[PDB]
Design a protein around this ligand. Structure first.
Ligand SMILES: CCCCCCCCCCCCCCCCCC(=O)OC[C@H](COP(=O)([O-])OCC(O)COP(=O)([O-])OC[C@@H](COC(=O)CCCCCCCCCCCCCCCCC)OC(=O)CCCCCCCCCCCCCCCCC)OC(=O)CCCCCCCCCCCCCCCCC
Ligand SMILES: CCCCCCCCCCCCCCCCC[C@@H](O)O[C@H](CO[C@H](O)CCCCCCCCCCCCCCC)COP(=O)(O)OCC[N+](C)(C)C
Ligand SMILES: CCCCCCCCCCCCCCCCC[C@@H](O)O[C@H](CO[C@H](O)CCCCCCCCCCCCCCC)COP(=O)(O)OCC[N+](C)(C)C
Ligand SMILES: CCCCCCCCCCCCCCCCC[C@@H](O)O[C@H](CO[C@H](O)CCCCCCCCCCCCCCC)COP(=O)(O)OCC[N+](C)(C)C
Ligand SMILES: CCCCCCCCCCCCCCCCC[C@@H](O)O[C@H](CO[C@H](O)CCCCCCCCCCCCCCC)COP(=O)(O)OCC[N+](C)(C)C
Ligand SMILES: [Ca+2]
Lengths: 110, 319, 54, 306, 107
């Protein structure tokens, strides 16, 4: 994406100062800007998310991961249900600190 | 080395001081044969070789037969090759124009200075990247001071064209003096720009008689019509408007009035038996004119590697 | 984010069925409709001798 | 004006292609034609007392067949026109009778009180000869050329070099979209030039019309990779067309056409264009164009020898 | 909204090259942009919240839902009461089944 931005910058500059005048190349830039503004809205229309850099990066990373995991036949379901049980048992160990070390009443669930 | 010079050096037989030359036999082969396989190799020359070669024109006939008479003892360079090659396909009524073109009018005849101008055109086109040939010895004397009038020029060009027609006739008739209609049919179908001769072969199998002959004068007249085909089509464009197919009598009258070469009923009957795709007794200008369009037959190869460009243009324009 | 509070991975992002086709089937026809609107309005304005460029 | 602009563009386009019946139906009265309407139909993007059109105006409305004959007499060169006349004459004697002319003009009636009073008398009897035929040829061509000349607003009986170049590029109906830039540049290239008197452009137009023979006359320059030149153009125009050309006209034609070259004007540059345009006798405006362009591009790309 | 953006692109790009010139249409585009900014500010003035895509979509959806609920005589109050009481009862049941405490036998 960075390389493409740089390429467009270079194309516009070269065609603006060398071959064609700015009076010919101003509408091209305006309509490129408007097309970008329209694509950033179509993105939200079709993904239900606003076009922000970190959110787009995370969505693309998740799609790449969920394709590479299908290609490799990785038991993602077992992995998730196994990483949630370690979390449950550590939250239980954290709860058990009150009635066993400081002799205070146990905290309820939540 | 352009394509024409490449073809010339391929069909050449003599080299001298790093300059390829050619004998009338090789010129005739280049005219009538698309590709020739030279069993032997090129040979160099000396002044004695030059005189042994030029010793033929002194006892050669300046009539209708001149090249086969010379045989192999002749000399032709690249410039004369191109000049003769343009003569081959030059129609009538352009003879006098070509003659007046070959001389700035400071000389009403042609001295060898004008052929030197032609060679200078060739050399200027070449570089911007002494030796007497047989043709100069025919037009101009051995001394080199000889005027060439227009009547002799016209006679020479007519003789060359007729000599080529005789050569092609004897090459397609296997030696006999009456070629079969099938030979004329295949000679016509050779240069037609179609992909399926099957319909024409069916026509000549069904419609054309089993046995029928064609003389020599008729073949020459048809060749002259073929070389005036452009003027003939210009005259026939008025008739092509309204899309009116032309019958046989009007075809004969029109070719007679536009080309001066009256044709026989045999050749016209034959060409209508081969080319009438429809069922009517006569068919429109479409097939005959559009199909018989090249006229670049009889050697005259234009090999601008048009194979792939032709395939591309086919893929494009086919609609 | 790419992980939950625990180490689990987020579910796959729910994509739209034929999204790019469904958006280019809306952008282009309305683009041409706007072109037609502009042409007809310019012609109506120039015919009645209201605004002529040159 | 945009609407009138597109109207004139469509009229010019239908003039350029699909001529025979569509144009004749496109210009009429109220099924016949009128001479001033004929002149309008033959000029792109657009009473005499000395012209041919005045004589027809005195006469009755022109027929469709007459229109076809007028198109052919404007189109064909002189020698081919003489051949066409010799073909017109059915009988032996070199004079076309009214009956045979009627036959060869009715042969064009496919969609099923003429110029005869100019060829024949009011009794429709007087047969003409080849001399009067060629005289009418020359008169009509010189007259339409004079009308085109005077349509371009002349100064001192002369015409700016840019206007002559525009008329020339308009004669050969090729829209290269780049030769127009050369047309525009011709003015500054000929800053404060001459006026290109009517006789010069007349001679150049008769030469251009007689190019089908010019091509085969310089056939040795072809088949040898050669290119044209100023002096050679002078010579071939003097010999074939049998008319002189001032050096200024050859100079401006070179400046207009020899774009890729360096003053040589090879076959593909000038001669091929006119040779192809003289053979006009044989959104949809995108397919064929793009196809031809792509074909040429592919050919040029594949052009890398063996 | 997407179709409107597209037709505006078309109606503005047709003029600047075919009928009129850019020297005529540039200020029109600038004033269209500034009017868009003024409208995006008036949206905040009216709705008391910034104009962003997902929040505007959610606001429009809530308005549509609360109009359809009144058009159909839906009982949102009892629905919300039940949806809260269910969560409360589930929390009570989950707290009474705590593995760390002995509210119930081992079962
Ligand atoms: C009158 C004059 C006016 C005329 C002008 C008219 C035009 C004006 C109006 C313009 C308004 C248009 C607005 C609509 C477009 C915006 C849509 C959008 O952003 O959707 C978001 C959408 C949301 O994504 P998502 O739903 O999360 O899934 C996305 C993925 O990442 C994909 O899934 P994945 O996980 O498999 O992804 C893998 C990964 C990598 O890719 C892959 O491997 C995936 C693809 C494999 C296929 C596997 C699945 C296939 C199934 C298809 C999906 C279903 C249907 C869609 C397919 C149909 C396509 C027709 O993907 C990516 O890398 C994504 C980035 C794509 C960037 C590519 C851009 C190329 C441009 C090149 C520039 C030029 C080069 C210079 C050349 C030099 C010359 C010598 O993103 C995409 O779909 C990205 C593709 C769109 C391209 C980027 C932006 C487009 C820019 C517009 C160009 C218009 C042409 C201009 C012409 C100029 C005039 C002549
Ligand atoms: C196997 C993988 C191979 C991939 C090979 C392809 C490599 C290139 C793929 C395309 C890269 C996309 C990255 C982003 C493109 C350029 C960055 C773009 O966002 O810049 C904007 C220019 O925009 C673009 O020109 C058009 C926008 C089109 C958006 C749709 C793109 C499709 C999304 C692809 C998903 C991956 C995106 C990854 C982004 C990190 C700057 O304009 P700006 O004024 O500042 O707009 C404000 C931005 N805000 C809102 C975030 C503040
Ligand atoms: C980064 C995310 C993508 C955003 C979207 C980018 C794409 C939109 C931006 C592209 C700008 C448009 C450039 C198109 C140039 C317009 C030039 C053309 O339309 O005008 C011609 C000038 C019209 O001349 P005319 O003679 O009338 O008609 C012939 C049309 N031809 C030339 C195309 C055949
Ligand atoms: C019941 C059926 C209804 C049928 C109705 C069909 C037609 C209704 C659609 C009419 C338009 C309504 C939607 C308008 C959305 C398009 C406007 C916007 O998307 O385009 C912006 C251009 O703006 C417009 O030109 C003017 C905006 C004025 C706001 C109008 C208030 C809309 C109230 C209704 C909201 C409906 C939900 C909208 C979904 C987002 C892009 O330009 P940009 O510069 O990049 O703005 C940056 C956006 N940021 C700030 C969030 C990043
Ligand atoms: C939402 C985004 C909108 C963007 C803005 C779009 C604007 C479209 C064009 C707006 C109007 C164009 C005005 C140009 C008028 C031409 C000026 C010329 O005609 O000079 C005239 C001479 C003076 O105008 P006049 O006819 O006196 O106007 C009368 C109105 N008054 C009384 C208020 C002044
Ligand atoms: Ca500006």
């Amino acid at each position: 994406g960075l390389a493409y931005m740089a390429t467009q910058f270079g194309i516009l500059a070269r065609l603006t100062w060398w071959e064609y005048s700015w009076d010919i190349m101003e509408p091209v830039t305006y309509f490129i800007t408007y097309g970008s503004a329209m694509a950033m809205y179509a993105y939200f229309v079709m993904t239900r998310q606003e076009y922000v850099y970190p959110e787009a990066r995370d969505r693309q990373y998740l799609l790449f991961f969920h394709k590479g995991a299908k290609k490799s036949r990785f038991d993602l379901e077992k992995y998730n249900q196994l990483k949630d049980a370690i979390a449950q048992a550590e939250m239980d160990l954290k709860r058990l600190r009150d009635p066993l070390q400081v002799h205070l009443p146990l905290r309820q669930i939540g | 080395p352009s394509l024409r010079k490449q073809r010339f050096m391929q069909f050449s037989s003599l080299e001298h001081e790093g300059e390829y030359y050619m004998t009338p036999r090789d010129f005739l082969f280049s005219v009538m044969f698309e590709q020739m396989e030279r069993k032997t190799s090129v040979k160099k020359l000396t002044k004695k070789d030059i005189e042994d070669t030029l010793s033929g024109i002194q006892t050669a006939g300046c009539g209708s037969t001149f090249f086969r008479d010379l045989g192999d003892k002749g000399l032709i360079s690249y410039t004369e090759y191109l000049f003769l090659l343009t003569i081959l396909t030059k129609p009538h009524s352009g003879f006098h124009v070509a003659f007046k073109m070959l001389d700035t009018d400071g000389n009403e005849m042609i001295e060898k200075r004008e052929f030197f101008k032609l060679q200078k055109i060739i050399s200027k086109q070449d570089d911007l990247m002494e030796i007497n040939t047989t043709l100069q010895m025919r037009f101009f004397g051995k001394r080199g001071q000889r005027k060439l009038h227009y009547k002799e020029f016209r006679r020479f060009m007519e003789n060359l064209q007729t000599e080529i027609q005789e050569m092609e006739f004897l090459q397609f008739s296997k030696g006999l003096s009456f070629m079969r209609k099938e030979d004329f049919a295949e000679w016509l179908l050779f240069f037609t720009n179609t992909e399926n001769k099957d319909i024409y072969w069916k026509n000549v199998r069904e419609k054309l008689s089993a046995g029928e002959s064609i003389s020599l004068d008729e073949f020459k007249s048809f060749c002259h019509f073929t070389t005036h085909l452009e003027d003939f089509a210009i005259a026939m464009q008025m008739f092509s408007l309204a899309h009116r197919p032309v019958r046989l009598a009007e075809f004969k009258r029109a070719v007679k009035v536009a080309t001066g070469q009256e044709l026989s009923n045999n050749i016209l009957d034959t060409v209508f038996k081969i080319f009438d795709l429809d069922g009517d007794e006569c068919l429109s200008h479409e097939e005959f004119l559009g199909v018989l369009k090249n006229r670049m037959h009889r050697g005259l190869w234009v090999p601008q590697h048009q194979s792939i460009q032709e395939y591309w243009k086919c893929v494009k324009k086919e609609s | 984010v790419i992980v939950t509070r625990s180490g689990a991975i987020l579910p796959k992002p729910v994509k739209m069925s034929f999204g790019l086709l469904r958006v280019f089937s809306i952008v282009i026809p309305f683009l041409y409709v706007g072109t037609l609107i502009s042409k007809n309005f310019a012609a109506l304005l120039e015919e009645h001798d209201i605004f002529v460029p040159e | 004006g945009f609407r009138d602009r597109k109207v004139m563009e469509y009229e010019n386009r239908i003039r350029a292609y699909s001529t025979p019946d569509k144009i004749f139906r496109y210009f009429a009265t109220l099924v016949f034609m009128t001479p001033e309407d004929f002149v309008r139909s033959i000029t792109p993007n657009e009473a005499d007392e000395g012209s041919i059109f005045y004589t027809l105006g005195e006469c009755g409305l022109i027929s469709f067949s007459d229109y076809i004959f007028l198109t052919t007499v404007l189109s064909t060169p002189q020698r081919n026109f003489e051949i066409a006349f010799k073909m017109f004459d059915l009988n032996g004697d070199g004079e076309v009778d009214m009956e045979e002319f009627e036959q060869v003009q009715s042969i064009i009636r496919s969609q099923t009180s003429a110029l005869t009073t100019y060829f024949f008398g009011a009794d429709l009897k007087g047969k003409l000869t080849i001399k009067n035929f060629l005289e009418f040829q020359r008169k009509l061509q010189h007259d339409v050329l004079k009308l085109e000349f005077e349509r371009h607003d002349p100064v001192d009986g002369r015409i700016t070099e840019r206007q002559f170049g525009g008329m020339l590029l308009a004669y050969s109906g090729v829209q290269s979209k780049k030769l127009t830039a050369m047309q525009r540049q011709l003015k500054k290239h000929f800053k404060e030039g001459k006026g290109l008197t009517f006789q010069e452009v007349e001679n150049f137009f008769t030469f251009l019309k007689n190019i089908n023979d010019v091509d085969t006359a310089l056939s040795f320059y072809h088949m040898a990779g050669a290119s044209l030149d100023k002096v050679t153009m002078q010579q071939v125009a003097r010999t074939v067309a049998k008319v002189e050309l001032s050096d200024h006209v050859c100079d401006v034609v070179f400046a207009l056409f020899d774009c890729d070259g360096n003053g040589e004007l090879s076959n593909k540059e000038f001669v091929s264009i006119m040779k192809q345009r003289l053979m006009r006798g044989l959104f949809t405006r995108l397919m064929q164009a793009m196809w031809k362009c792509a074909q040429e591009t592919a050919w040029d790309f594949a052009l890398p020898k063996q």
